[PDB]
PDB file of C-alpha atoms and ligand atoms in Angstrom:
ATOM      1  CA  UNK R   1     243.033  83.750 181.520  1.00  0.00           C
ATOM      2  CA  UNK R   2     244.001  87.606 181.174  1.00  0.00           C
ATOM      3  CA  UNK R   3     247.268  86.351 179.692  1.00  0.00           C
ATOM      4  CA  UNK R   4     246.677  85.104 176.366  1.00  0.00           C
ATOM      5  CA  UNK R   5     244.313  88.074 176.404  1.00  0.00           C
ATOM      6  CA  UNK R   6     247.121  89.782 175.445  1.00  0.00           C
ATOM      7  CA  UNK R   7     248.706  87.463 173.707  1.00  0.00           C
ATOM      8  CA  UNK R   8     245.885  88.352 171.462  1.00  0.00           C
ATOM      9  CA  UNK R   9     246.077  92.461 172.057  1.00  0.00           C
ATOM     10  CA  UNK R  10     249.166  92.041 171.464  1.00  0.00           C
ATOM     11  CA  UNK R  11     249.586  89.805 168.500  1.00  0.00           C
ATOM     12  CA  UNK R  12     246.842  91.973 166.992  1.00  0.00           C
ATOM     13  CA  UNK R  13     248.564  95.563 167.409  1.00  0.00           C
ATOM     14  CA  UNK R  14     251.641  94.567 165.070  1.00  0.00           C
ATOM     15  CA  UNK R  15     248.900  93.357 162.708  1.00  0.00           C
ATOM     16  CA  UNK R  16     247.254  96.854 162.089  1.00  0.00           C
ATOM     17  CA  UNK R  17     251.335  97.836 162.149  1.00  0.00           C
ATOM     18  CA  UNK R  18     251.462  95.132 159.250  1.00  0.00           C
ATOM     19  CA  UNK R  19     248.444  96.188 157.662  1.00  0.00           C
ATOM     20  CA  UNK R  20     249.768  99.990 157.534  1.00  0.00           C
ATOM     21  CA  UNK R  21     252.987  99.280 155.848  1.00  0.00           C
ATOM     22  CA  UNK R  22     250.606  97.640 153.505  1.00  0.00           C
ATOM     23  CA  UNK R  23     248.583 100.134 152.190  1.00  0.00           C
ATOM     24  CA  UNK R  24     251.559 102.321 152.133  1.00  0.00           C
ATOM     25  CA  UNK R  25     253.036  99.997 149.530  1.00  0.00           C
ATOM     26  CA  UNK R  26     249.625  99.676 147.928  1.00  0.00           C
ATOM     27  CA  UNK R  27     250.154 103.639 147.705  1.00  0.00           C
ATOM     28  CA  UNK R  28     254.000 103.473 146.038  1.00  0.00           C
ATOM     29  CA  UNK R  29     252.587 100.757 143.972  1.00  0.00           C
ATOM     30  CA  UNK R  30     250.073 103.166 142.400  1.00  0.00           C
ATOM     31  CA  UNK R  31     252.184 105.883 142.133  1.00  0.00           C
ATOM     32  CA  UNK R  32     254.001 103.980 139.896  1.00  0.00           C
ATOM     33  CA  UNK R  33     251.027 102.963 137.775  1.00  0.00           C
ATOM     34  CA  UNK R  34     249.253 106.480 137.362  1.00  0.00           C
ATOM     35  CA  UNK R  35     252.648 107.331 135.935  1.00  0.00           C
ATOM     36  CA  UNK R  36     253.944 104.340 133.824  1.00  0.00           C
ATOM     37  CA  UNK R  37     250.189 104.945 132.378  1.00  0.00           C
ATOM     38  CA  UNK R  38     250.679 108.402 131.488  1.00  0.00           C
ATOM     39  CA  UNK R  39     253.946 107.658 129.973  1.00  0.00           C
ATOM     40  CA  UNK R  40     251.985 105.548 127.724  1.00  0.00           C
ATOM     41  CA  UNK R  41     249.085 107.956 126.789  1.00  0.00           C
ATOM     42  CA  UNK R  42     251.746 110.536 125.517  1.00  0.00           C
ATOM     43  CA  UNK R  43     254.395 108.239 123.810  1.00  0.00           C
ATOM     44  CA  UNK R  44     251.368 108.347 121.402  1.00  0.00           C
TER      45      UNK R  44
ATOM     46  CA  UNK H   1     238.927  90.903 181.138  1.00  0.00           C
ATOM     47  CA  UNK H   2     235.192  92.375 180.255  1.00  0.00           C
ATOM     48  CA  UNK H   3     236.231  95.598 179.135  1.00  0.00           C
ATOM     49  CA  UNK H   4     239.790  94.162 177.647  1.00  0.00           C
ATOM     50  CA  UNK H   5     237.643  92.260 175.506  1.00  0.00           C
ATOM     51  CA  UNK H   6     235.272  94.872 174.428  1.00  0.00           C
ATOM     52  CA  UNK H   7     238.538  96.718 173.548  1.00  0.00           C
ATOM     53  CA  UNK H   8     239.871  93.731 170.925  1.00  0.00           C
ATOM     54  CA  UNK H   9     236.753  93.808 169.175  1.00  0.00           C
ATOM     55  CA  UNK H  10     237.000  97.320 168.434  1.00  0.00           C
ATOM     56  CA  UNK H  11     240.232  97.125 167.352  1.00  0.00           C
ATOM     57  CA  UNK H  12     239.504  94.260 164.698  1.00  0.00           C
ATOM     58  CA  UNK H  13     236.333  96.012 163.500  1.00  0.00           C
ATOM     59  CA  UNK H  14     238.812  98.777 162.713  1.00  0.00           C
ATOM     60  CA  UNK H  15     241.297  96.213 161.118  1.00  0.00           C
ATOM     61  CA  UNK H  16     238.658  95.510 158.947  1.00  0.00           C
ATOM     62  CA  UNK H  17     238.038  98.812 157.606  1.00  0.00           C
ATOM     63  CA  UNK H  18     241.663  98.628 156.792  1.00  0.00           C
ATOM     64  CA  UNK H  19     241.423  95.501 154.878  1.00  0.00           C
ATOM     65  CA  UNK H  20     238.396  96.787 153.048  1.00  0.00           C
ATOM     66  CA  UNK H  21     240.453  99.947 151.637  1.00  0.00           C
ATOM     67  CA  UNK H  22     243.109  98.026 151.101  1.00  0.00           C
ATOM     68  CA  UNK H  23     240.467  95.504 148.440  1.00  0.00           C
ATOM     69  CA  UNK H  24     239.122  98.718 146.758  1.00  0.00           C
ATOM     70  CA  UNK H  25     242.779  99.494 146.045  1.00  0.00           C
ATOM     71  CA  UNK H  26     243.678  96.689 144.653  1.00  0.00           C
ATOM     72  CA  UNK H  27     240.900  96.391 142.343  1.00  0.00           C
ATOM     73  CA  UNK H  28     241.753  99.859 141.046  1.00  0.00           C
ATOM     74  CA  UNK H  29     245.386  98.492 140.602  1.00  0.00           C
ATOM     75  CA  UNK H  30     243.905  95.526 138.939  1.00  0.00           C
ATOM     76  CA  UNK H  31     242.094  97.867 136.092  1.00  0.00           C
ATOM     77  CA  UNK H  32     245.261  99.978 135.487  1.00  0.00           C
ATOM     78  CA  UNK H  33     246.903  96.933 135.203  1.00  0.00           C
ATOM     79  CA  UNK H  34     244.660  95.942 132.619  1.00  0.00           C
ATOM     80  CA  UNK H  35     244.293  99.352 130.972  1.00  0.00           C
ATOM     81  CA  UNK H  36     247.669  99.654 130.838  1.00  0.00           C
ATOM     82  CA  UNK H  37     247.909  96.350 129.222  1.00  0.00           C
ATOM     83  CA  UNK H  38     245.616  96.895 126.461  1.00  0.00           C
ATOM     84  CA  UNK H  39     247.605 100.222 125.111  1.00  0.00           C
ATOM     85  CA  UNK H  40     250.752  98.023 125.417  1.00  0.00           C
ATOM     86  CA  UNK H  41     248.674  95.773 122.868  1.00  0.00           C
ATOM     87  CA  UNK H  42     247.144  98.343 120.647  1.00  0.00           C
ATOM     88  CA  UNK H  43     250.674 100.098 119.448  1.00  0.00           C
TER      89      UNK H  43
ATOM     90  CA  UNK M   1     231.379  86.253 178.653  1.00  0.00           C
ATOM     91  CA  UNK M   2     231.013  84.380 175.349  1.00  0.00           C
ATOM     92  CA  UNK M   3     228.671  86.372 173.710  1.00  0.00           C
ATOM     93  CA  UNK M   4     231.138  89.922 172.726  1.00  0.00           C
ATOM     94  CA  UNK M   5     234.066  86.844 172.651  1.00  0.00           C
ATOM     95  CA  UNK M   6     232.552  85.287 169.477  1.00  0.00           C
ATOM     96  CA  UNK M   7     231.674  88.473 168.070  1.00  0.00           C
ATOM     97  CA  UNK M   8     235.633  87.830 167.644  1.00  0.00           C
ATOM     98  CA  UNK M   9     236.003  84.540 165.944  1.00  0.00           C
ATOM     99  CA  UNK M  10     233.228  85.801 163.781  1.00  0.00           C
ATOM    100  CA  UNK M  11     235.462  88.680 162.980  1.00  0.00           C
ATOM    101  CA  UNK M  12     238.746  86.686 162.119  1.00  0.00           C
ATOM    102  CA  UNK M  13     236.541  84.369 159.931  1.00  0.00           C
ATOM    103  CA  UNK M  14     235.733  87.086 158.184  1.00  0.00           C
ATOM    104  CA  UNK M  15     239.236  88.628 158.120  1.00  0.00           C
ATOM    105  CA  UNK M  16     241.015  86.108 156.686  1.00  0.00           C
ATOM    106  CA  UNK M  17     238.243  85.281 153.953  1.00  0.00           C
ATOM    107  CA  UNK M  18     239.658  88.846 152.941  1.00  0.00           C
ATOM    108  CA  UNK M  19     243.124  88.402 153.188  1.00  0.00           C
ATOM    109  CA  UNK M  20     242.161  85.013 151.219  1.00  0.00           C
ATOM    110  CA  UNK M  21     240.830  87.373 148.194  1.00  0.00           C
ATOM    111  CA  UNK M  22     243.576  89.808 147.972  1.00  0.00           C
ATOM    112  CA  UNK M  23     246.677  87.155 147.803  1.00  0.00           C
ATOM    113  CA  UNK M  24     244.270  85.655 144.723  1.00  0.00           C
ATOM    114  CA  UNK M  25     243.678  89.000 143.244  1.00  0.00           C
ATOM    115  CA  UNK M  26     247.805  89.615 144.259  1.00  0.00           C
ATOM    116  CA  UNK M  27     248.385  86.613 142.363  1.00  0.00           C
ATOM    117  CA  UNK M  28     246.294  88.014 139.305  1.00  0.00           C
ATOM    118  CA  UNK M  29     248.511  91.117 138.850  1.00  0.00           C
ATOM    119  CA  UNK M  30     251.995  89.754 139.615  1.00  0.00           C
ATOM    120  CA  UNK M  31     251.715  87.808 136.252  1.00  0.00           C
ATOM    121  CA  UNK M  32     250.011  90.974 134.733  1.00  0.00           C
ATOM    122  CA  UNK M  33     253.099  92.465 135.591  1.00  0.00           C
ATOM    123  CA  UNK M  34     255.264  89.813 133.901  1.00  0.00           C
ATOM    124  CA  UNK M  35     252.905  90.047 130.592  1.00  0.00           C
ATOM    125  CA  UNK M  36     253.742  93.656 130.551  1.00  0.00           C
ATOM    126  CA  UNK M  37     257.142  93.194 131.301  1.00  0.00           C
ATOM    127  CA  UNK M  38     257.683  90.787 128.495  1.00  0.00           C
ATOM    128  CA  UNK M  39     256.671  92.834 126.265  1.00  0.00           C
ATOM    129  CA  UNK M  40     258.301  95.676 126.989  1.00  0.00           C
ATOM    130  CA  UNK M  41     261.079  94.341 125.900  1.00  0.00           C
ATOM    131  CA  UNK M  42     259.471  93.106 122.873  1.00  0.00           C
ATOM    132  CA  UNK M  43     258.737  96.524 122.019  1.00  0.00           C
ATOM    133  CA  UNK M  44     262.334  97.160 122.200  1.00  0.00           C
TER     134      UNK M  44
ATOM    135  CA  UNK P   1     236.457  79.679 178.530  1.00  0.00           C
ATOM    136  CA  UNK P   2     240.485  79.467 177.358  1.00  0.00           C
ATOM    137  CA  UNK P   3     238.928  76.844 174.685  1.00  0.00           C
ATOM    138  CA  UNK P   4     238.009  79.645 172.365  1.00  0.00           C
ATOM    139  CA  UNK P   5     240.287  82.159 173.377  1.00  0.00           C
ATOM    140  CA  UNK P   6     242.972  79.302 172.513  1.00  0.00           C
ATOM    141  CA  UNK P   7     241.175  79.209 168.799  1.00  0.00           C
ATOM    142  CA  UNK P   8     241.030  82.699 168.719  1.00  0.00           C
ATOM    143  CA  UNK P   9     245.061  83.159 169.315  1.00  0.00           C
ATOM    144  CA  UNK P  10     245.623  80.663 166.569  1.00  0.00           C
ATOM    145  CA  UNK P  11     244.127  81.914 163.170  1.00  0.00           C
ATOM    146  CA  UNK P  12     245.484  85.706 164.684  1.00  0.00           C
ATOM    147  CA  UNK P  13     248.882  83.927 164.371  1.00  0.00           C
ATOM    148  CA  UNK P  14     247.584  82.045 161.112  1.00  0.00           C
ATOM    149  CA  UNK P  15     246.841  85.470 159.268  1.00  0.00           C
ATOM    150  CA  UNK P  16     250.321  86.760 160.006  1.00  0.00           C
ATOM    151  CA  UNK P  17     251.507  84.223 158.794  1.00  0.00           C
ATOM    152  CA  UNK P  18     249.582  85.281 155.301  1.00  0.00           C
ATOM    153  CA  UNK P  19     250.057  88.945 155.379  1.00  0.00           C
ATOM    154  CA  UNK P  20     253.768  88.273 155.866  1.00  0.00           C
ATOM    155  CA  UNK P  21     253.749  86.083 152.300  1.00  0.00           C
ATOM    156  CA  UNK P  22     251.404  88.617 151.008  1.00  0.00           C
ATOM    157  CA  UNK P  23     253.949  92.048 151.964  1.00  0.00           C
ATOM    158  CA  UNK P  24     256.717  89.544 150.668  1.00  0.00           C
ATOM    159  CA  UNK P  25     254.665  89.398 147.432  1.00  0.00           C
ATOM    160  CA  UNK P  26     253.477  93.007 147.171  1.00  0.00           C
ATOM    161  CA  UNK P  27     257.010  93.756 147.131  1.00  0.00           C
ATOM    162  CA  UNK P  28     257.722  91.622 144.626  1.00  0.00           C
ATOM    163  CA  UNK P  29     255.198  93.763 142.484  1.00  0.00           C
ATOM    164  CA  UNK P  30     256.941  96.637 143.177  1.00  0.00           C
ATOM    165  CA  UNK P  31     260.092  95.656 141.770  1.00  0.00           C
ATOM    166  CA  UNK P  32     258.367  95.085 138.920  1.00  0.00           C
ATOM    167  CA  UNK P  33     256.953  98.318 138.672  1.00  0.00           C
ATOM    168  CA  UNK P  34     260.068  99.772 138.996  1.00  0.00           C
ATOM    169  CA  UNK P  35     261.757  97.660 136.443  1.00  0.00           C
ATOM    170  CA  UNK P  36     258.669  98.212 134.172  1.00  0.00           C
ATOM    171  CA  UNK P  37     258.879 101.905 134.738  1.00  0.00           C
ATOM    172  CA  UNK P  38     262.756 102.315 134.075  1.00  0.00           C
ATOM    173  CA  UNK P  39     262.603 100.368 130.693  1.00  0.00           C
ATOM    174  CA  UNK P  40     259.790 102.903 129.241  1.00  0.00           C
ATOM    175  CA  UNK P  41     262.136 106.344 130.687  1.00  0.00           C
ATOM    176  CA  UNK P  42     264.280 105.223 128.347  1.00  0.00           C
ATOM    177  CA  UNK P  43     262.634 104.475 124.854  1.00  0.00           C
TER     178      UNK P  43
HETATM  179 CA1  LIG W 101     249.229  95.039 144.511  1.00  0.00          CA
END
């Protein structure tokens, strides 16, 4: 009724908690590209 | 439950906008990828 | 009623259409990765 | 009624089940990034 209403609030919180820790590792994971790329343009 | 439901849609129109930035990002990281890749190839 | 509690299921359709694309386009660079990787070493 | 919300519960539970194999696989780029990045600080 109400209960697996939240079952559903709840489940869906921790996905916008899963999400975040995503883009955070989309953000590390560019980090490292901007820089392994520059790297490159130099060691030229 | 009316205004408990009103509150989950909200909440997944704003879990969209995070899976949206999250598909711009990756197609930058594709290109870098890819950019990267080619220089790699040229020397 | 049913009306704002479909304007739900259309959502998670939608959702997971995206997270569909990005594990594909994950998929993509993991082995652009391992090209670059390979080489790397080559170039060594 | 609970028909739909029942659906509704499911593919929520479905999609963490895919953004769990899809962390599990951006980390597994990041290693690689890493790795990658080392290997050029050095020549
Ligand atoms: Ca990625």
């Amino acid at each position: 009724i109400e209960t697996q209403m939240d079952r559903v609030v709840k489940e869906m919180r921790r996905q916008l908690e899963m999400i975040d820790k995503l883009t955070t590792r989309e953000i590390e994971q560019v980090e490292l590209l901007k820089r392994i790329y520059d790297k490159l343009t130099v060691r030229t």
